[PDB]
DNA sequence: GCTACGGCTATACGG
DNA sequence: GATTCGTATC
């Protein structure tokens, strides 16, 4: 009389829907995090959705928090629901790890934070990255285990004017921890993948034995086979097979069979565009499929870099010179139409057309890369700070002005090799 | 001095079975409505096929006498915040309501595509300890927009687009039920408008009747005008320039419609076009965008969509 | 004080008799309030039809001497955000009439120039208070409009003023105004208007003043030109025939002179010669292909500015080069 | 750095005034209120358009007032967080209204700030953490200078006057409106003209009572007058001065003698010209 | 000028203005000068409408020396005006309140001898409506109530403190002299009610009609669904008041007049929601049985 | 099922205290009635901080109890439910210009009560002026926990004057310090509220270190009995200090042994009980 | 004298 | 989506 995804849910650690590699790195982590020294603070975990990234926790935690606690059990999620009367939005998550911080001998609970803050709203984002900041920084010779489950998913469109982005197009651990936490030498960040085919074959059949009278009375029984490896192969998400399975089971008549769709990586849509899909041999459809479902992904410039640095993967890059020309000429072309719905349609459909009549059987490709434009404006930003204090130290000591271009032009590079040939005489 | 409810709202689906269309989906509703174990539903689908008209059916049909207080239909002319699902979602489904056996309170989140990113993060919340007692029904026109953790524990139940059939049975049940004189070709011609939208072809038929007495095809045609993104195509698709040149100035142009619409439904045609070759698509997507450009700027005049007519033809045509 | 005016506001229609062109919609919502209900209607065309003085002279003939408190107005002048939609709508179309008088009607002009979180939200506004509430739409771009909204709205469609009211209301403001109008001068008139009644009533009050006597003297098409800067047909015909027939030279020369004599712009001689080579044989295909775009890319350039006889000589080029592939 | 200042209330009612006058001041403007600290007296910093305050507090003030730095004529600046010393002062003054001196230490930076109550010893121990600035940006902080080309110094009528209140009521006039952010004030040969323009709303407060010290016109914002009128309640002594087009000084002073008299100076930026 | 009113004491008109603050905050205000005074009228989404008048006898100098219009009717904001008129006092200050007729400003000149300020607003068109459509139908007057200012006011006080999404009227009387009259609100409490005292002191009077405002019938209670958002714009009105009555009738238009020179009569009305669920008036009913 | 009426000023006073203190200890408060006294407690989402006031039999004039509806729990016979602190704390609230001339709170989950009334807890406030207010706040039926620490902890003994460590609190704010250092030695007995420092990357300055302190006596102590540097929370000791003043019926009790046994707090009234349960650092 | 209240203010949120 | 390496198992 309830959901399938619960009642029959994971008892113990063998139950749970996780490769061995993924389950024996996070049970390491754990326990180094729960040593008398803390090398690693907080466990950053991360994933797409229903990957068993909450189920685990708590089964390791039945048999690793009470070993290590004291004498004289479970998680410690934080509630994102609890109003407190005399209590701001943006303290209660401040309370929650200002008073989470006393589980250390005889109260040790592992904190689980799951549910993370309203971190759209940019006070509380930081507030929040300021407070883990903090945990990480503290003083306190003794601090409890934390972990942070970020659901990586992709933020639908929204009418917010511009509020910034990143936490606007995904809700990934790069878009609320910032670069400080995530290179912070006490931070492990684990990442999850979506649950395998055979895992979750095995699991659905696990359930089907596990209730097979009704089964066999909807003539289901006999079907269940084609069902279950239909399920399992069109998603990775434990819950939702487990959701279709039970919708499927209860219902009696022909329902076809439905799941969610999964979005489309980033680096999955660049193969997509520059290589193809094996499930649809149609270029038109799946195009029109790839803007529907996704179209935060594919409006971002980064894409349109994501094809100029990686359409040379086809081949090795052994394509012929002419297909390349016309990829990057209608790539500018795009670039050249103030980012309209077309130009992004239109630079993809010639990206794959393009790839599809050159097309050859037996020949390797290499690995993508994302584009190299941080780096490029990450060392732009170094040398205007260099021209600046180049042009600050010019005007005090004499009174001639230079203009920037002329500083990136001829004096950048000459002021060295006056300025400092003539130190060596001083 | 009216006091007349609009034959959309006069003839509204009180019942699971007077629904047309999606003959399979509306059965394992009925289903859901005999037994009661009604799961999470995510029902996507195209305007005006039926979705609020369903769940607020089951709804009425699985609550019964207790629908007043065990249904909580939310919309996007509700304030639907972070604030909001905290608090008034989040003591509707901790309200302990005493409910037959086998039901459960139905948040009916209407519109539910257009909540706010922290609604949704909220709702994951609320959901993940309220699913014993309450079970949301969400409805939205796309499915993505609802974020796919919440996805995860919600069954999904896509609706197809309404079938000329459906329509004609539940048109003929309203001119029965209302005694309105009615001609083949005229219901014909209300299908043909309706495309596929149940609610568009009975305020068609309405307005038809309120306005002109007999519905046939003409007097449908003389108050309801052709679907333009059938003009377009059909000016997109003609082989000769002239052709193209006067479906558009004497079907687009001359009848009121802006350059900018004429742009937009030409682009989303050549999106959801067929046997037409993937270079041609392309290359009118580019013309297409290159005009769609020029109106922006300001320039929207029939000169640009006569050019636009002209490339598409050319490269059609070759040389 | 309607006589310290301009022609565009004092001759708006107070009453449904008044909106000439638009018969078949005046006529179906004067069904629709003879017989009581009226659905949710929205007003689609081209600016300049008669899109707000339908909906107002229809508000007064409904609500006598209540226009005020049983219609709502909300306009692009005014904020038309979430906020707003869910409160101003909400408790006037959630409230009960003031004289059991009938249902509210809300007039939302330039409803394209609204976010759409606040058309998603107008809908359940318009569902849910509709025994009530009847919503009005106005609207010149339907892509701008949520196709939900769309769904749940009847569809006016305001096509661009016919010549025969566009006639009358001339004559109507000329009994007015006491003028004279030469019936070349009134096809002028129609073919500058292009299906818009406020384009005319500016056109003719800039005539009345352009006359010495506005009272003893008749608006000539001469007049209609030169109070606009408008080319007149003659020399965009000379025009044609010169580029079409002439060598460069005399073409140029031609193109110059009717330029500088009445200071007519190139863009308006180029809509002119597009207009004039539309009724054109013109048997090969690439002729049309290379004149459109050609053309629309010098307008394209005009309208970001240039050098203006750069510009006429690529019409010039572009014309000629286009009617050599019709030998 | 032995600097460890001690201030009394019940054997000097007016040095302490001046002392809580100009922390409620600097904690009112902006945080992070520079205190530089000197041999002979005292100077309370406050520096960001946006207006400076300037105050002259002697070393009589202090019973104590000792400090000792290898810098220039001991020289100690601190950039302290005025609102924790808006806060020990509060107290402080509680623990008045309800006979221990203010003793305060420099501890290691930190502010030692401690006082005793009696309702009985309640020892108030108040560490404050405070910055410490270096030679450098002590010399990059310094009073501004005013040209006196043609400033008026017109003389405000005494608080103990009976013009006094009326002319506090004058100035307030402009205080108690909403829309009010910038206040065009005009000087002639002497009356003030408070006037306000604006798109609709116009005024034209004056003042028609006795004045002492062409004429002067500046727009000074209305955030900076609030904390002017409130300079002009506490001290008796007031001079406002009007830069054409210039600036705007507003010159309070408390004569203390003899000894040295303290004055507090705040230089108003005309927000927008004439 | 054409109006030129002269007054000593600006506490009252202060108070006056300020009891319509809960409206629009910086809107604007309709303002009719006429023989017997000047008077403030401001509708909020054409659903309330609030009316203040000052008569003459609280002014000291009343002119009105206009005589081509029996009444002059200007358009001035409400925040300037009521700032101004919050001058306070230390010495009287004689406001000289003037308007010299078409395109001239609403000038507020206050002398304080000391202090001789002058205010001028630019005064707005029109609010371009027929401004009467509020009024009630004296003839199918449902009820007549009577209640003191202080009761009414701590009632909507404690309704604004609990939230009160929307509020009902309720009204019955019956033949054993026990007249019921009560507020509940919908609020995310539920269903809460606020039974005022059937005392004279309380309650004054109160008479259910049957829609013709002769006949008093018994049994018969009259529900009165309103919006909160528009009932608690006159909780401070009522919070200077002495008696407050109450008039709704048939057509879902309540009218409020508050009283405090006869004083100053605030005389409001109000429009009632639909009552979309049929439910909710039997819920009501039932709950009022207890 | 039960009633309870509150006919008096202080004794509403310091009910509408412990409400909001409840409150702005957890969202929703947990109620327990039983047929001697009545028990509303809250405890916080960390399981740290928990609060627990006893409203005894005396304390209500009319305090009836019939267990015999038709959730129930039994152990003694007591009733729990669960209802929103912050909807509860706004009907408590003192109306000013006003008084509440009697504050009862019942509940009815018999056959005789409609669907209005199932499962909505009845509180009737009756103004001086005769004005009846009627609430019906919902409520869940739950069941409770006694947390058996009061038992075992009666280790060292502190009993405090609550007048200067209220006014030390009210002083304190919980946005600048967050912890409370009570130190208490034979000579003297001191309270600071310190606040620990963070330091950035490149030895940055992340959160400031604001030191409050208040050093008073020992002789002053009522009962100093220590058989101590103990830190804990601010913010709720402030709260259940200033829950006890809010009747003009003023000490304080103070029970810990070790830096990771929870501290125990307990100040009483006539009619009203008080206790708080904190968890220390064990930070040695 | 203390109260209960009017005005001030620090402020979490708003759009 | 493609590559390289890596166990695990029938
Ligand atoms: N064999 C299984 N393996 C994993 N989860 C299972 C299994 N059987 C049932 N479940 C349930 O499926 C759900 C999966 O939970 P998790 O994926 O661990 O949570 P999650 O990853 O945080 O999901 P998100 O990110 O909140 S959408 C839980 O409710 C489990 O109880
Ligand atoms: N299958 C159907 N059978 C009968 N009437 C239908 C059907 N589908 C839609 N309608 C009519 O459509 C009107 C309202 O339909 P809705 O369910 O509100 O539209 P919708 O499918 O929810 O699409 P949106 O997204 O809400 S615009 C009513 O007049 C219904 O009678
Ligand atoms: N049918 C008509 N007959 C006579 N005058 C008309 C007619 N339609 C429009 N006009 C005139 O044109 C003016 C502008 O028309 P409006 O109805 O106010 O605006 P509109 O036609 O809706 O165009 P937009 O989209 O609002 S810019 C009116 O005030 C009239 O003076
Ligand atoms: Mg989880
Ligand atoms: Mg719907
Ligand atoms: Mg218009």
Not at chain 1, 369 to 396: G, H
Not at chain 2, 78 to 84: K, M, Q
Not at chain 6, 155 to 176: A, E, H, P
Request: charge should be neutral; include cysteine.
């Amino acid at each position: 009389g309830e959901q399938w995804y619960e009642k029959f849910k994971p008892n113990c650690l063998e139950q749970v829907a996780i490769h061995k590699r993924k389950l024996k790195d996070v049970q390491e982590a754990l326990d180094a995090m729960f040593l008398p020294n803390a090398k690693h603070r907080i466990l950053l975990l991360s994933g797409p959705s229903g990957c068993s990234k909450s189920t685990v926790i708590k089964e390791l935690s039945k048999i690793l928090v009470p070993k290590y606690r004291q004498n004289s059990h479970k998680v410690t999620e934080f509630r994102g629901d609890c109003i407190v009367n005399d209590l701001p939005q943006m303290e209660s998550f401040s309370e929650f790890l200002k008073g989470a911080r006393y589980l250390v001998m005889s109260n040790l609970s592992l904190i689980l934070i799951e549910d993370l803050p309203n971190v759209f709203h940019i006070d509380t984002r930081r507030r929040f990255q300021q407070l883990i900041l903090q945990w990480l920084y503290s003083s306190e010779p003794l601090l409890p285990p934390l972990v942070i489950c970020i659901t990586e998913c992709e933020i639908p469109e929204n009418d917010n004017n511009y509020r910034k982005f990143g936490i606007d197009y995904t809700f990934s651990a790069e878009t609320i921890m910032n670069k400080e936490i995530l290179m912070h030498p006490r931070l492990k960040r684990i990442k999850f993948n979506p649950i395998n085919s055979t895992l979750l074959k095995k699991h659905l059949k696990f359930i089907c034995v596990q209730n097979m009278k009704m089964l066999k009375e909807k003539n289901k029984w006999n079907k269940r086979q084609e069902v279950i490896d239909y399920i399992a192969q069109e998603t990775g998400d434990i819950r939702s097979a487990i959701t279709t399975l039970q919708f499927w089971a209860t219902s009696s008549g022909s329902l076809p069979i439905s799941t969610r769709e999964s979005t489309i990586s980033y680096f999955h849509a660049i193969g997509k565009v520059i290589h193809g899909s094996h499930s649809t041999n149609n270029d038109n459809e799946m195009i029109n499929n790839l803007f529907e479902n996704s179209n935060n992904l594919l409006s971002k410039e980064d894409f349109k870099l994501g094809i100029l640095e990686n359409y040379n993967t086809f081949n090795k890059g052994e394509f012929s010179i002419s297909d390349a020309s016309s990829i990057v000429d209608c790539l500018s072309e795009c670039d050249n139409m103030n980012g309209l719905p077309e130009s992004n349609e239109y630079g993809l459909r010639e990206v794959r057309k393009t790839f599809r009549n050159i097309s050859k059987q037996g020949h390797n490709h290499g690995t993508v890369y994302f584009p190299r434009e941080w780096k490029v404006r990450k060392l732009q930003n170094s040398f205007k700070v260099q021209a600046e204090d180049w042009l600050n130290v010019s005007l005090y000591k004499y009174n001639a002005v230079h203009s920037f271009r002329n500083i990136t032009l001829e004096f950048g590079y000459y002021a060295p090799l006056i300025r400092k040939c003539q130190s060596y005489k001083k | 001095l009216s006091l007349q409810l609009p034959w959309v709202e006069k003839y509204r689906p009180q019942v699971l079975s007077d629904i047309v269309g999606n003959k399979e989906t509306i059965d394992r509703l009925q289903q859901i409505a005999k037994d009661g174990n009604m799961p999470h539903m995510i029902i996507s689908g195209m305007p005006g096929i039926g979705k609020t008209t369903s769940v607020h059916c089951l709804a009425h049909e699985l609550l019964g006498r207790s629908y007043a207080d065990g249904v909580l239909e939310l919309n996007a002319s509700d304030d639907r915040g972070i604030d909001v699902v905290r608090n008034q979602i989040k003591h509707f489904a901790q309200k302990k309501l005493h409910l037959p056996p086998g039901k459960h309170k139905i948040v009916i989140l209407d519109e539910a595509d257009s909540m706010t990113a922290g609604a949704q993060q909220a709702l994951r919340r609320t959901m993940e300890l309220y699913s014993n007692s309450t079970r949301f029904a969400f409805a939205c026109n796309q499915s993505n927009k609802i974020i796919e953790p919440l996805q995860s524990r919600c069954a999904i139940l896509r609706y197809s687009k309404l079938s000329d059939e459906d329509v004609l049975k539940r048109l003929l049940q309203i001119i029965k039920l209302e005694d309105v004189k009615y001609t083949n070709d005229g219901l014909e011609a209300i299908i043909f408008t309706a495309e596929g939208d149940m609610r568009q072809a009975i305020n068609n038929l309405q307005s038809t009747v309120a306005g002109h007495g007999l519905v046939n095809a003409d007097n449908v045609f003389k108050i309801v005008d052709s679907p333009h993104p059938l003009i377009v195509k059909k000016m997109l698709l003609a082989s000769n320039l002239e052709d193209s040149i006067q479906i558009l100035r004497t079907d687009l142009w001359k009848k009121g419609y802006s350059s900018i619409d004429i742009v937009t439904t030409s682009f989303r045609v050549t999106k959801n076009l067929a046997q037409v070759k993937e270079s041609v698509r392309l290359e009118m997507i580019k013309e297409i965008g290159l005009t769609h450009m020029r109106i922006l700027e300001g320039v929207g005049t029939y000169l640009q969509l006569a050019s636009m007519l002209a490339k598409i033809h050319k490269l059609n045509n070759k040389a | 004080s309607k006589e310290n005016l301009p022609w565009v506001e004092k001759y708006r229609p107070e009453t449904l008799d008044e909106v000439y062109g638009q018969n078949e919609v005046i006529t179906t919502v004067r069904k629709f309030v003879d017989e009581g209900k009226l659905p949710h209607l929205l007003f689609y065309g081209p600016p300049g039809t008669g899109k707000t003085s339908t909906i107002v002279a229809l508000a007064r003939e409904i609500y006598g001497k209540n226009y005020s408190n049983m219609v709502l107005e909300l306009n692009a002048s005014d904020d038309r955000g979430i906020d707003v939609v869910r409160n101003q709508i909400k408790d006037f179309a959630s409230t009960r009439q003031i004289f059991s008088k009938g249902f509210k009607l809300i007039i939302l002009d330039e409803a394209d120039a609204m976010t759409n979180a606040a058309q998603n939200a107008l809908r359940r506004v318009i569902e849910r208070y509709t025994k009530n509430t009847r919503f009005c739409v106005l609207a010149n771009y339907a892509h701008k409009l949520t196709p939900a909204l769309l769904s749940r709205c009847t569809r006016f469609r305001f096509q661009p003023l016919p010549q025969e009211a566009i006639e009358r209301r001339i004559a109507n403001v000329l009994v007015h105004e006491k003028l004279k109008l030469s019936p070349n001068a009134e096809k002028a008139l129609i073919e500058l208007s292009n299906g818009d009644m406020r384009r005319v009533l500016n056109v003719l009050q800039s005539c009345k003043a352009t006359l010495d006597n506005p009272d003893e003297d008749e608006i000539s098409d001469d007049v209609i030109y030169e109070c606009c800067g408008a080319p007149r047909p003659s020399d965009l015909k000379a025009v044609l025939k010169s580029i079409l027939e002439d060598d460069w030279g005399t073409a140029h020369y031609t193109l110059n002179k009717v330029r500088s004599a009445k200071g007519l712009a190139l863009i308006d001689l180029i809509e002119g010669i597009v207009k004039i080579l539309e009724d054109y044989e013109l048997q090969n295909e690439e002729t049309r292909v290379h004149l459109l775009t050609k053309l629309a890319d010098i307008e394209y350039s005009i309208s970001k500015g240039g050098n203006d006889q750069i510009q006429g000589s690529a019409v010039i080029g572009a014309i000629k080069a286009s009617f050599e592939n019709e030998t | 750095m032995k600097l460890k200042l001690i201030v009394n209330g019940c054997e000097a009612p007016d040095d302490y005034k001046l002392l809580r006058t100009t922390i409620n001041t600097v904690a009112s403007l902006r945080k992070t209120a520079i205190l530089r600290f000197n041999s002979e007296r005292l100077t309370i910093i406050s520096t960001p358009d946006t207006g400076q305050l300037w105050c002259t507090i002697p070393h009589d003030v202090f019973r104590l007032y000792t400090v000792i730095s290898a810098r220039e004529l001991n020289t100690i600046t601190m950039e302290c967080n005025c609102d924790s010393l808006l806060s020990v002062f509060k107290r402080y003054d509680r623990v008045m209204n309800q006979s221990s001196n203010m003793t305060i230490k420099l501890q290691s930076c930190a502010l030692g700030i401690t006082f005793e109550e009696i309702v009985k010893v309640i020892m108030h121990s108040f560490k404050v953490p405070v910055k410490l600035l270096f030679r450098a940006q002590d010399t990059r902080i310094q009073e501004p200078m005013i040209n006196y080309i043609q400033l008026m110094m017109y003389k405000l009528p005494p608080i103990s006057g009976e013009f006094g209140s009326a002319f506090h009521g004058f100035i307030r006039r402009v205080e108690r409106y909403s829309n009010v952010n910038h206040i065009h004030l005009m000087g002639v040969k002497v009356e003030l003209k408070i006037i306000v323009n604006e798109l609709d709303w116009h005024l034209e407060i004056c003042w028609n009572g006795p004045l002492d010290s062409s004429t002067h016109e500046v727009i000074i914002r209305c955030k900076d007058w609030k904390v002017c009128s409130k300079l002009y309640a506490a001290f008796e002594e007031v001079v406002l001065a009007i830069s054409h087009d210039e600036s705007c000084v507003f010159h309070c002073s408390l004569d203390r003698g003899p000894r040295e008299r303290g004055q507090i100076i705040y230089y108003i930026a005309r927000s927008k010209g004439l | 000028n054409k109006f030129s009113a002269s007054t000593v004491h600006l506490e009252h008109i202060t108070t006056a203005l300020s009891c319509l603050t809960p409206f629009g905050s910086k809107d604007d205000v309709l303002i009719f000068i006429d023989a017997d005074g000047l008077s403030f009228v401001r509708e909020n989404n054409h659903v309330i409408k609030i009316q203040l008048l000052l008569s003459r006898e609280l002014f000291m100098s009343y002119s009105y020396r206009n005589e081509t219009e029996d009444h002059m009717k200007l358009c001035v904001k409400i925040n300037h005006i009521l700032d101004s008129v919050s001058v306070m006092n230390r010495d009287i200050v004689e406001c000289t309140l003037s308007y010299d007729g078409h395109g001239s400003p609403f000038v507020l000149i206050f002398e304080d001898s000391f202090i001789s300020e002058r205010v001028e607003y630019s005064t707005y068109l029109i609010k371009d409506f027929d401004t009467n459509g509020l009024e009630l139908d004296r003839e199918r007057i449902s009820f007549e109530a009577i209640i003191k200012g202080e009761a009414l006011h701590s009632a909507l006080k404690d309704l604004k403190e609990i939230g009160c999404k929307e509020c009902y009227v309720y009204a019955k009387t019956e033949a054993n002299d026990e007249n019921v009259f009560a507020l509940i609100s919908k609020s995310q409490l539920g269903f809460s009610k606020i039974k005022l005292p059937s005392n004279r002191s309380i309650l004054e009077k109160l008479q259910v009609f049957d829609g013709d405002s002769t006949t008093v019938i018994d049994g018969f209670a009259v529900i009165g669904f309103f919006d909160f958002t528009s009932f608690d714009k006159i909780r401070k009105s009522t919070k200077i008041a002495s008696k407050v009555l109450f008039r709704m009738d048939v057509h879902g238009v309540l009218s409020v007049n508050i009283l405090s020179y006869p004083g100053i009569v605030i005389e409001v009305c109000m429009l009632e929601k639909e009552s979309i669920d049929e439910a909710a008036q039997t819920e009501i009913e039932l709950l009022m049985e207890t | 099922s039960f009633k309870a009426t509150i006919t008096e000023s202080g004794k509403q006073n310091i009910w509408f205290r412990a409400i909001y203190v409840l409150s702005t200890i957890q969202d929703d408060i947990k109620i327990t009635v039983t047929t001697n006294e009545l028990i509303a407690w809250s405890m916080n989402e960390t399981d740290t901080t928990l609060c627990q006031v006893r409203f005894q039999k005396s304390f209500f004039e009319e305090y009836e109890f019939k267990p015999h509806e038709i959730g129930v729990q039994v152990i003694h016979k007591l009733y729990s439910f669960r209802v929103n602190g912050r909807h509860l704390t706004t009907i408590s609230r003192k109306p000013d210009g006003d008084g509440i001339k009697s504050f009862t709170i019942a509940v009815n989950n018999t056959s005789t009560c409609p669907e209005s009334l199932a499962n909505r807890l009845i509180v009737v406030i009756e103004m001086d002026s005769l004005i009846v207010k009627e609430y019906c706040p919902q409520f869940q039926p739950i069941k409770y926990d006694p947390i058996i620490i009061n038992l075992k902890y009666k280790i060292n003994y502190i009993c405090c004057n609550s007048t200067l460590l209220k006014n030390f609190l009210d002083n304190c704010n919980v946005n600048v310090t967050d912890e409370v250092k009570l130190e208490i030695n034979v000579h003297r007995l001191s309270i600071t509220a310190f606040t620990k420092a963070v330091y950035g990357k490149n030895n940055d300055l992340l959160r400031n270190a604001l030191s409050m302190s208040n050093t008073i006596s020992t002789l002053d102590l009522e009962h100093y009995c220590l058989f101590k540097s103990i830190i804990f929370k601010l913010k709720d000791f402030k709260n259940f200090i200033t829950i006890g003043p809010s009747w003009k019926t003023d000490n304080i009790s103070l029970w810990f042994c070790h830096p990771g046994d929870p501290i125990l707090m307990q100040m009483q009234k006539p009619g009203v009980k008080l206790e708080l349960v904190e968890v220390t650092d064990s930070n040695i």
